Amino acid sequence: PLRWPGLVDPNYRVGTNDLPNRITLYNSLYRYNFTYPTLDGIMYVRSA
Amino acid sequence: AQRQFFGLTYNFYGQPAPLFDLNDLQELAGCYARPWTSRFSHLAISTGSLPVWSARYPSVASRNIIVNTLLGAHLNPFAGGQVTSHQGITWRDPVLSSLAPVPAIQPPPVWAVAENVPLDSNNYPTYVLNLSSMWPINQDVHIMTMWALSDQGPIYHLEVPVDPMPAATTAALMAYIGVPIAHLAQTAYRFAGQLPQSPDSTMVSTIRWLSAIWFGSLTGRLNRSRTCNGFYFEFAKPALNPDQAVLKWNDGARAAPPAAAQSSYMRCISPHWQHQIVEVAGALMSQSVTAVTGLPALIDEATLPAWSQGVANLTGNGQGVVPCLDYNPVPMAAARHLQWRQDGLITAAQEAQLNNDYTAYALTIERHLTAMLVANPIAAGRMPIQPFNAADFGQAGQTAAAVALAQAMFV
Amino acid sequence: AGPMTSDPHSPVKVFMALANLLAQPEPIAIGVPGMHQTTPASQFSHPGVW
């Protein structure tokens, strides 16, 4: 069970690990939806 | 820009020497690289992604704490006007670009150890003469001072003007909507860190507002029901991990500006801050503003540790003195929840549940930290976590006054 | 043709248009951080940048 604390441990808290010593295979993470606007998508590109 | 700063080195908690080993220096400022903007290089969106739970540096604040202690051993030029060496390591150049072992031919004088050393920029003229390149030192020294001045949480400053937000800040914030607090804090640190800026700059006002909004939402005064010009912060569920906040903009009712300009100093009164990312990011973000603009006024000595009593250019008890408030997260959370119920965002049943969840969460942080301290006794020669006593987790502090300030701050 | 349109910002835009053409002979201080007398007038499209 030690490698799956976030799956079987009743006392598991989101946002914890033991990374420098052991690797856990089931965790919680973030995901993103960044967009990458071009320069002209930022400002009025024309003459100023 | 700003051609002058003042500072104060750390305090030895009874120990005879600054608390860090060679490995700490070698890892946290090695490789002959510039150490002057590294504070966020070892932070991320959340604790789950960080190795802050075990081994060396077993706390969120641990690394930055050690950094501050490390700097205290090498900031002598701003105290005595001369570069020195400590345990065989010194600066490579008068510009203080980086550290290296001492040369064998003409070693600099060995630093005489001391604690709580006041610092003046004027003691080292070459700094001003090379201000354009030595600017990053200003920010970090300020940060170190703002932390060194207090036990438990670091100190930071808040203020709200009587005017509405300028358009420039509005547009900037409208691009920072979905960003978590940690990323926001990095940009503020990155901005003020790398090149001189005048206080009359758009970013400066922008970050100033962010600190205000963060606190207002932290106290629960700013919510979906009531917002500052449409902005407010949203906090994660205590049932999973309340140590997270993101920016939000909303069509809710807008709070009126205060009758007069409000300002004060703040700090966390309880050890929880050492392992709570929102506290660290909020403090650093707020401190960045004061770094570029300097301290508006002397800090009140009334509620500060003994070494902080009457520090020149930093603390005072006279007329021109701004009080400093403090709070404990647990009572703060209860106040925030209560405000939500009164605004009608939640029912009474939910409010009781939220208090139980948050208290349970906070208990884990305390239990982790207290166990971590005995694992790293300060007598070992390095301080990964600031010492504390068990009763410190129970202090209510000035929390009642704090929410009162936000009450007056966002009418 | 100013007052014919329905854009609330139309008066300001009309004003700035002339201001752009008179930047050299009649320079003035536009007390808005982030704007200048030579900013294209059509872009003054918000309150608070008045």
Question: What does it look like?
Answer:
This is part of a larger assembly, with 2 copies of chain A and 1 copy of chain B (411 residues). Chain A has 1 helix and no strands. By secondary structure, chain A is mostly loops. The longest helix of chain A is centred in the N-terminal third of the chain and has 4 residues. Chain B has 411 residues and is α/β, with parallel strands linked by helices. In chain B, strands 5-10-14 form a 3-stranded mixed β-sheet. A 3-stranded parallel β-sheet of chain B has the order 12-11-13, with no helix packed on it. Chain B has a two-stranded antiparallel ribbon with strand order 1-4. Classes of the chains: A little secondary structure (48), B alpha/beta (411). At the B-C interface, helix 6 of B face loops of C.
Biggest interface and residues each: A-B, 13 and 15 residues
**Oligomeric state of the chains present here:** part of a larger assembly
Strand order of the largest sheet of chain B: 5-10-14
Number of strands of chain B: 14
The profile of the biggest β sheet of chain B is: 3 strands, mixed
Task: Give me the secondary-structure category of chain A.
Answer: little secondary structure
Tertiary shape of chain A: rod-shaped
Sheet-strand content of chain A, in percent, reads: under 5%
Given helix and strand content, the structural type of chain B is alpha/beta
Radius of gyration computed on alpha carbons of chain B: 21 Å
Whole-angstrom Rg of chain A? 21 Å
Largest sheet of chain A: none
Provide the β-strand percentage band of chain B: 5-15%
Shape of chain B: globular
Order of helices and strands of chain A: H
Query: What's the total count of β strands of chain A?
Result: 0
Q: If helices are DSSP runs of H or I spanning 4 or more residues, what is the number of helices of chain A? A: 1
Helix content of chain A: under 10%
Family (chain C): Belongs to the turreted BTV-fold inner capsid family.
Protein name (chain C): Inner capsid protein VP3
Subunit structure (chain C): Homodecamer; each decamer is made up of two conformers of VP2, called VP2A and VP2B. 12 homodecamers assemble to form an icosahedral capsid. Interacts with VP6.
Subcellular location (chain C): Virion
